[PDB]
Amino acid sequence: PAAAQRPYSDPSDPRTAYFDEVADALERSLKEIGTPYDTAISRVVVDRGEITFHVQREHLLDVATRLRDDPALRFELCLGVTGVHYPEDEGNELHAVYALRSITHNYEIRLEVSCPDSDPHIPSIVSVYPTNDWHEREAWDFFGIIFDGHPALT
Ligand SMILES: [Co+2]
Predict the structure, then answer these.
(1) CA pair distance 23, 21, nearest whole angstrom
(2) Which residue range(s) make up the domain with 124?
(3) How many domains, in total, are found in the chain?
(4) For this protein, what is the EC number (predicted)?
(5) Which of 87, 81, 142 has its CA nearest to residue 112?
């Protein structure tokens, strides 16, 4: 899907109300720890009332940490990663989709990290969200995405 254009929030779809605010807050958190938003997030997509931040694997662990700990984000719930494979998407054929939810601020977003079949590694985020352990494990079983740092790999 094509890159969403600002504003991500749309008046006629309440479901998107907080998208621009969440996006801003995420840019701010990463600047604060010395990471340009554009270097960490490659693309934002808005489809059927859901926002997806396409995150670079290199920076997934930091983004996740910032999403959980920053008071302006506070995503406590990690619904569980899901794998998706695109044979025609050369160099980025293995994707992982993470639905996250913030009860505090009443937000919902998705992260989406990809990696090539030639180097199928995405960092585990069990350190941040323990719940994600089995989901990463299942993503590995079916797709072959190696979740570096996963408890089972020590
Ligand atoms: Co493949």
Answers:
(1) 5
(2) 1-154
(3) 1
(4) 7.1.1.-
(5) 81
Query: Which tokens in the block code for residue 131?
Result: 């719940």
Rounded distance from Cα 117 to ligand 1 centre (Å):
5
CA of 84 to the centre of ligand 1 (A): 10
Dist. CA 34 → ligand 1 center (Å) = 34
Measure 1 CA to ligand 1 centroid, in angstroms. 19
- Joined together, the tokens standing for residue 4 give 């969403």
- Please state, in angstroms and rounded to a whole number, the distance separating the CA atoms of residues 129 and 66: 12
Return d(Cα 24, Cα 46) in angstroms, integer.
15
DSSP for residue 53? E
Residue whose entry in the numeric block shows the structure tokens 């270097």: 39
Cα 26 to middle of ligand 1, angstroms: 31
Ligand 1 centroid to Cα of residue 85, in Å, is 6
CA of 121 to the centre of ligand 1 (A): 13
Resolution (A): 2.7
**What distance in Å separates the CA atoms of residue 149 and residue 52, rounded to the nearest whole number?**
24
